[PDB]
Design a protein around this ligand. Structure first.
Ligand SMILES: [Mg+2]
Ligand SMILES: [Zn+2]
Ligand SMILES: [Zn+2]
Ligand SMILES: [Zn+2]
Lengths: 262, 88, 518, 93, 84, 58, 168, 171, 35
DNA sequence: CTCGTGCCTGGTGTCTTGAATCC
DNA sequence: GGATTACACCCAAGACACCAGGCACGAG
RNA sequence: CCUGGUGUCUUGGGUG
């Protein structure tokens, strides 16, 4: 058995291509003298090929666009063969982490599994809004909080049993969502409970002004700053903001420019 | 929010032509919501700090993706003064 | 003064001792062990403990105090973590020196191949400089091609020594098994070399130019990586609510992911030829994390296609830490504009535009002789000249006079500071780039004037090599009593009339005035 | 304030001015060091007034320094590459 | 130990431009922090001016510690050094 | 020049930097031993005693 | 805060466990080494003080300073009021009163007699004066370092100490 | 355990204190700051010797701040206890967990598992005491204990004793 | 030192044997084979 | 009402072969 | 085989890809 | 009723 380096993600394609070549050449004068070929997911970027002569390995891969042209094949020891073909949990009452949907990343208890053996019913702390803005994603979801049936009663619900309600077509029993997930959609290994899981389980600014005394008499402006007695008017006419005393200003109101009786 | 004045914006979020503006005044008001009331964040555009003038014209349209799209052109007049450069 | 009071004694630095950080010491200063490459808890706010933004490493946010020192983000220096490596790897910087050490010592017990009995070698240990001594020793021992079990017993093991060669990040040693036969060069892994180095005696450690307390030779192999705090790798917001991570943050994630997969191998399905591909990849990421300009191999790339900014590249070149932030840097209290000439200014004056004079400031200490004068400036405020911008108490709290509506109710105490506007006869340092010689920086006396150019008396254009065709010049304002006196008594224009370059003046009567005086 | 302006102040001999420009008028920073091991490993809670270098088990021999922030940054980048820059405040010969 | 006795002082008896600048600045600084002034202050009230007045009358109460290359030093008072 | 190489080599051979150069002190922000920094200034306790007694520290 | 003549204590390759203070093993730490140096660099033996010496020096220093505070103008409760602050008042009063109830030779006449009698490691010489003993059997048990020295006089030491000792 | 130690203190002086009695101010300043204070390195500093004649040296002016730095070298009486040292004491309190004894400045705690069984706490007696027949431990009774451990708080140090050994106890 | 450096460099910035800047470069670079 | 197809969002992971002088 | 190649300053002009899985809508 | 944050990395075109 030789290993061969191939383009990442193209290992299954190379195994396929080798099979087509083998079957197409069976019984001809130039058979492909390989016995088998395979690719292990755990071993990214490699295909393994079974034969008697190295030349057959080169023959199997000739012209394959997914294989690195460098003469990189390597020999496997007989004592390493079976480990290449090693094929490899989940119990009711145990915890898993959800891998998809608004509950992605959340800890859940395994309640039960389907007869066929694919999806598992999970007990989950819900993330609900009680229909508050109706007329969901994992990035725009809700905080987790146990289902409250009286809140649902008040705001937006079918009773099914003691402590069991169907609310918006999902089932909540004693405050928890019970929802089926594909087993492939949950993580059962190396779960690390989090901290949180251990805990749980002046009236004239900006108004337009006219100046009635001084060298700037008759000009429009806006009150930029009115700290005290001395105002800052941003004059319109030249690009300058001036310091000015409060006796000098007329303010606009409902009827004309009004003195300091506004 | 920015430190400048917002009092020159109309209700459509856009300033109108004819209004004089000075530096750091907001001329286009825009917000972005904060992900998980009191939910948004300011994303407004202030006039460049060293400039002034008059808003001349405001284009409103949509872009290739269908969202709203604005342009604000400001005009001012530059008068020669000590330090300006000239050449034959 | 901008620093809150601390009872620890203030001292200056007299010596910098360089050396290596031992593995033990890295753990002793670390405040957290780093294991998980997922930065966020689960994208629901608050970053994950044990992750790369664990809050024990520090705060780069104005509203979260450091859970280690209690100080705000301004004072908090940041605290290091550590990352345990499943397998020891080489430090990319030290490989050529490691290679040199192999030819010096025995690859079984680690003893120096020569003794004081060799007369030339006894002369070489006397050389006082550690680097030259180490080289002189290696120059002798290089030709010694077998570690002798017996003196020419010395503690030797009798084995012949290999010729070690570097091939990228890997070292190959070719042993000559005992005319010509077949030699088998096997790879000299970091772990293999690591054990050999710990058995080197203290007496041979010194003779190799290393140092028992500060640079012990097995510390050139990396077993635990120090995790720098977030101050070294801050996040930036590209378009306000979207933030990307620093190149180091992404690269540390790659090392951390790669570290977990080395743990994932030794407990189950390892087809050996896979162990070598995964361990070499951990070596790769740790190498390009420190130096991504390794000759003879492709650079690590970001997904954008451009090369990763390694730590080595952070320090070198015009914009790096040393030439760009330490030998020179951007500074406060500076100004710049176009210059114009004025014959009706004294030689040592500079005309300063009013707008510039209201932005710059000098912190004048309040005393009995000027307290009445300084109160007048306070009433005028930041917008009327001559005025003032801040009042600074002995505790350091600044009162911003733009927003103080009860400015009339301030009474000044002796010892406070008032940051007043720049005013007539204050000395300032004036400067035009490129600063080719010392009279590119002379002290002038300010004269505040209308219009926006800097004014120079015409006879100083020559030492600056300035003219008025668009040139700009820089002005710097000293910020204390001590430096004002240094400017006026050492750098002032009249002291600079004669230059030491050619024992003659560098300023004279020029252009119109010189034409006219004839 | 570039490299060439630095040289001009040396030529003038204005050492005091050059120090102030590059510290008080810029990025001045206060750090704490351990008097034994010389590292910036001190954990300093100033309102509790308690200091400890955990490595040396030292709560008494501790100094404060005024250095540029960009120098503090430099030393932390060197630490991240396993280089130990030990700052001592006294000579020994 | 390092200190050199008064009778055996060898460095120049004139105040250098660098020593002068440091003395004026340091003394100026102390006056602005309300140190007792040793001369009469008339019309000239700037901190630098008062310090320059004290220098001209040989009344600045400071000592220069001039370090020699080996680390030894001669202490010279500003009262005894000749100022041009 | 050779900025990073110097520093790696300096670490591996435990170099001691005695901080007497101008450049050392400039980048650490300390008063450099040059010009106005080439000496220390001490307070003349002997000359202060010629002042009158009402100027005395309590 | 406050420091001494002894400095640096930079790191060494070999650690040391002769530092932990053990009066039995003559380990007084790095500050109380056998050979100290004063503020001029001169060599000097460690100054360990018996209860009798210490009572004279401290009381003399306080009354000479008290006289100096009075421009030049006995009981322990009066001597402790010279200090400044209630914190200082406490430690000084408690130290005199403690010495007032355990110092055998409470005057300088007897003390100088004990001084000449005692004036060989300097720490052991000071220990023998502080701890009263009757016989040779009692001294080498409570102070087990006097075992293997083979130089008694011990008995005549204790006899003179007990004879100079006034009744009570 | 009493010693004489040559110590020094860095003193920073504000420029407004630069008058003709500067040294006398510093002498008062040194005493106020040092007398009665404790450190783990030296112990309790009881009294400073020759306070009115201390030579303070010359003050270094700090560049950039104007303040002056004095190194005041001095000589003091210091008190530090030591592990292994046998000492006498005066009992301050008696409790079910042992007793507290004032040895000059500080207090030493001896716990119950290191006290011999025949010494029985007797509250009914007037006044309360640890009693035997020819032994009498009331407040002020000379007792002989041995310091078996020193703990340091750098502000006040704490030492634990024992009377679980030969010849130690009341006399 | 610095005064010497500037005094020599500044004239060079404004300036059959080799002369001028190429000759100056040979000296500082103490080339073994001059032109 | 159920099934199939298309579109959108989220997560994970690279690769057909194609400027000149000095030490 | 790399490292070296003036200084400072202004301003305008830009941004991951592919595959797989899940959900929703439309048609039979 | 004091505090108060708006990006980076390049490339290109310019000024002395
Ligand atoms: Mg020009
Ligand atoms: Zn912190
Ligand atoms: Zn060997
Ligand atoms: Zn330490």
């Amino acid at each position: 058995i030789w290993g061969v380096k191939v383009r990442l993600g193209k290992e299954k394609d190379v195994v396929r291509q080798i099979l087509k070549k083998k079957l197409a050449r069976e019984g001809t004068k130039n058979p492909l003298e390989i016995y088998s070929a395979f690719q292990r997911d755990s071993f990214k970027g490699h295909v393994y090929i079974e034969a008697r002569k190295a030349e057959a390995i080169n023959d199997a891969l000739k012209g394959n666009v997914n294989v690195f042209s460098n003469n990189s094949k390597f020999l496997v020891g007989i004592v390493e063969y079976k480990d290449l073909l090693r094929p490899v949990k989940l119990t009711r009452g145990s915890y898993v982490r959800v891998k998809n949907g608004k509950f992605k990343g959340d800890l859940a208890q395994v309640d039960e599994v389907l007869e066929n053996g694919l999806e598992a019913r999970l007990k989950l702390v819900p993330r609900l809004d009680y229909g508050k803005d109706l007329s969901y994603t994992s990035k725009f979801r809700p905080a987790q909080r146990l289902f409250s049936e009286a809140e649902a009663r008040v705001h937006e619900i079918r009773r099914d049993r003691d402590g069991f309600v169907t609310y918006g077509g999902e089932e909540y029993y004693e405050g928890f969502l019970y929802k089926t997930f594909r087993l492939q959609n949950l993580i059962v290994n190396s779960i690390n409970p989090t901290l949180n899981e251990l805990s749980l389980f002046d009236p004239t600014l900006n108004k337009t002004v006219k100046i009635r005394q001084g060298g700037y008499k008759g000009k429009i402006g806006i009150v930029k700053e009115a700290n005290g007695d001395r105002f800052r008017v941003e004059l319109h006419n030249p690009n300058k903001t001036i310091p000015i005393p409060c006796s000098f200003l007329l303010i606009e109101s409902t009827h004309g420019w009004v003195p300091y009786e506004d | 929010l920015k430190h400048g004045t917002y009092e020159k914006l109309d209700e459509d979020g856009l300033i109108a032509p004819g209004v004089r503006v000075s530096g750091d005044d907001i001329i286009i008001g825009k917000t972005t919501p904060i992900p998980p009331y009191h939910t948004k964040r300011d994303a407004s555009t202030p006039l460049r700090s060293t400039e002034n003038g008059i808003v001349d014209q405001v284009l409103l349209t949509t872009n290739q993706e269908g969202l709203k799209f604005v342009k604000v052109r400001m005009r001012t007049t530059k008068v020669p003064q000590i330090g300006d450069k000239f050449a034959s | 003064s901008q620093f809150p009071y601390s009872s620890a004694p203030l001292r200056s630095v007299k010596e910098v001792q360089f050396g290596l950080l031992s593995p033990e010491e890295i753990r002793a200063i670390s405040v957290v062990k780093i294991e998980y490459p997922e930065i966020m808890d689960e994208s629901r706010q608050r970053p994950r403990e044990g992750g790369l933004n664990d809050p024990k490493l520090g705060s780069i946010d104005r509203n979260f105090k450091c859970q280690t020192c209690g100080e705000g983000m301004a004072e908090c220096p940041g605290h290091f973590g550590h990352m345990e490596l499943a397998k020891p790897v080489f430090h990319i910087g030290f490989i050529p020196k490691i290679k040199k050490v192999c030819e010096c010592i025995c690859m079984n017990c680690g003893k120096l191949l020569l003794d004081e009995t060799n007369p030339t070698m006894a002369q070489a240990i006397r050389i006082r400089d550690p680097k030259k001594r180490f080289n002189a020793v290696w120059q002798l021992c290089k030709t010694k091609m077998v570690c002798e079990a017996d003196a020419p017993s010395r503690g030797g093991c009798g084995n012949t020594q290999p010729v070690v060669r570097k091939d990228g990040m890997k070292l190959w040693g070719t042993w000559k098994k005992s005319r010509d036969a077949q030699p088998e060069r096997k790879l000299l892994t970091p772990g293999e070399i690591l054990n050999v180095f710990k058995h080197i005696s203290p007496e041979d450690c010194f003779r190799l130019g290393f140092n028992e307390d500060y640079a012990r030779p097995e510390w050139m192999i990396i077993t635990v990586l120090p995790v720098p705090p977030p101050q070294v790798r801050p996040s930036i917001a590209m378009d306000e609510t979207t933030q990307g991570q620093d190149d180091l943050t992404h690269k540390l994630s790659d090392i951390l992911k790669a570290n977990i997969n080395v743990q994932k191998l030794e407990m189950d399905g390892s087809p050996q030829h896979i162990i070598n591909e995964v361990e070499q990849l951990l070596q790769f990421h740790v190498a390009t994390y420190m130096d991504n300009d390794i000759a003879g191999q492709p650079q690590a790339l970001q997904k954008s296609g451009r090369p990763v900014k390694a730590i080595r590249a952070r320090l070198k070149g015009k914009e790096g830490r040393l030439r760009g932030n330490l030998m020179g840097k951007r500074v406060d209290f500076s100004a710049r504009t176009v210059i114009s000439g004025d014959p009706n200014l004294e030689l040592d004056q500079v005309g300063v535009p009013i707008s510039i004079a209201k932005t710059l400031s000098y912190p004048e200490t309040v005393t009995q002789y000027n307290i009445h004068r300084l109160t007048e400036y306070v009433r005028n405020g930041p917008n009327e000249h001559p005025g003032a911008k801040y009042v600074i108490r002995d505790n350091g709290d600044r009162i911003d006079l733009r927003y103080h509506k009860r400015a009339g109710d301030i009474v000044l105490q002796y010892g406070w500071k008032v940051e007043r506007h720049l005013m007539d006869d204050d000395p300032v340092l004036f400067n035009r780039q490129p600063s080719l010689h010392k009279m590119s920086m002379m002290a002038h006396r300010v004269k505040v004037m209308p219009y926006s150019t800097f004014r120079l008396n015409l006879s100083v254009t020559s030492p600056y090599n300035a003219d008025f065709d668009g040139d700009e010049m820089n002005l710097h304002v000293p910020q204390s009593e001590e430096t004002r006196a240094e400017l006026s008594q050492l750098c002032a224009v009249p002291l600079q009339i004669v230059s030491p370059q050619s024992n003659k003046p560098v300023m004279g009567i020029v252009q119109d005035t010189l034409c006219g005086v004839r | 304030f570039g490299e060439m302006e630095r040289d001009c102040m040396i030529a003038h001999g204005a050492a005091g001015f050059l120090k102030e420009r590059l510290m008080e008028a810029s990025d001045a920073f206060r750090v704490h060091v351990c008097g034994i091991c010389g590292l910036m490993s001190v954990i300093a809670n100033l309102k509790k007034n308690q200091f400890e270098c955990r490595s040396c088990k030292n709560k008494t021999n501790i100094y404060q320094l005024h250095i540029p922030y960009a120098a503090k940054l430099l030393f932390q980048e060197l630490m991240a590459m396993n280089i130990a820059p030990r700052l001592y405040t006294e000579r020994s010969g | 130990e390092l200190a050199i006795l008064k009778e055996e002082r060898t460095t120049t008896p004139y105040l250098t431009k660098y020593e002068r600048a440091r003395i004026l600045g340091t003394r100026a600084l102390q006056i602005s922090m309300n140190a007792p002034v040793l001369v009469d202050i008339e019309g000239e009230t700037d901190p630098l001016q008062i310090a320059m007045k004290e220098l001209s009358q040989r009344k600045i109460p400071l000592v220069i510690r001039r370090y020699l290359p080996d680390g030894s030093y001669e202490d010279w008072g500003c009262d005894e050094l000749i100022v041009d | 020049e050779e900025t990073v190489e110097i520093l790696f080599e300096a670490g591996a051979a435990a170099e001691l930097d005695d901080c007497r150069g101008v450049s050392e002190n400039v980048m650490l922000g300390q008063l450099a031993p040059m010009g106005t920094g080439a000496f220390d200034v001490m307070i003349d306790e002997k000359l202060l005693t010629s002042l009158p007694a009402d100027y005395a520290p309590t | 805060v406050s420091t001494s003549t002894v400095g640096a204590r930079r790191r060494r390759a070999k650690q040391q466990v002769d530092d932990e203070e053990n009066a039995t093993l003559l380990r007084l730490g790095p500050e109380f080494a056998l050979k100290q140096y004063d503020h001029d660099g001169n060599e000097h033996d460690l100054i360990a003080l018996s209860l009798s010496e210490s009572r004279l020096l401290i009381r003399e220093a306080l009354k000479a300073r008290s006289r100096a505070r009075n421009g030049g103008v006995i009981d322990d409760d009066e001597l402790a009021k010279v200090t400044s602050g209630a914190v200082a008042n406490g430690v000084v009063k408690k130290t005199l009163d403690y010495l007032n109830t355990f110092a055998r030779f409470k005057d300088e006449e007897t003390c100088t007699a004990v001084d000449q009698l005692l004036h060989l490691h300097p720490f052991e010489i000071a220990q023998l004066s502080s701890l009263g003993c009757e016989d040779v059997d009692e001294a080498i048990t409570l102070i087990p370092s006097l075992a293997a020295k083979k130089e008694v006089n011990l008995q005549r030491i204790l006899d003179e100490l007990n004879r100079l000792e006034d009744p009570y | 355990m009493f010693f004489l130690k040559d110590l020094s203190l860095i003193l920073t002086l504000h420029p407004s204190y630069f008058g003709p009695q500067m040294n006398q101010y510093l002498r008062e300043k040194l005493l106020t700051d040092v007398e009665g204070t404790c450190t783990g390195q030296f112990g309790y500093i009881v009294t400073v010797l020759d306070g009115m004649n201390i030579d303070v040296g010359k003050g270094r002016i700090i560049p950039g701040s104007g303040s002056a730095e004095f190194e005041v070298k001095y000589r003091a009486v210091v008190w530090k206890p030591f592990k292994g040292e046998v000492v006498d004491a005066i009992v301050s309190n008696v409790s079910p967990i042992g007793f507290f004894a004032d040895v000059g400045p500080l207090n030493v705690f001896v716990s119950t598992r290191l006290i011999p069984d025949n010494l029985v706490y007797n509250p009914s007696n007037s006044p309360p005491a640890y009693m035997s027949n020819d032994e009498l431990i009331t407040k002020g009774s000379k007792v002989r204990l041995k310091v078996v451990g020193t703990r340091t708080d750098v502000n006040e140090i704490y030492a634990i004793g024992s009377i679980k050994e030969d010849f130690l106890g009341a006399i | 030192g610095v005064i010497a450096a500037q005094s020599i460099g500044e004239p060079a910035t404004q300036m059959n044997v080799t002369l001028g800047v190429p000759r100056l470069k040979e000296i500082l670079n103490v080339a073994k084979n001059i032109k």
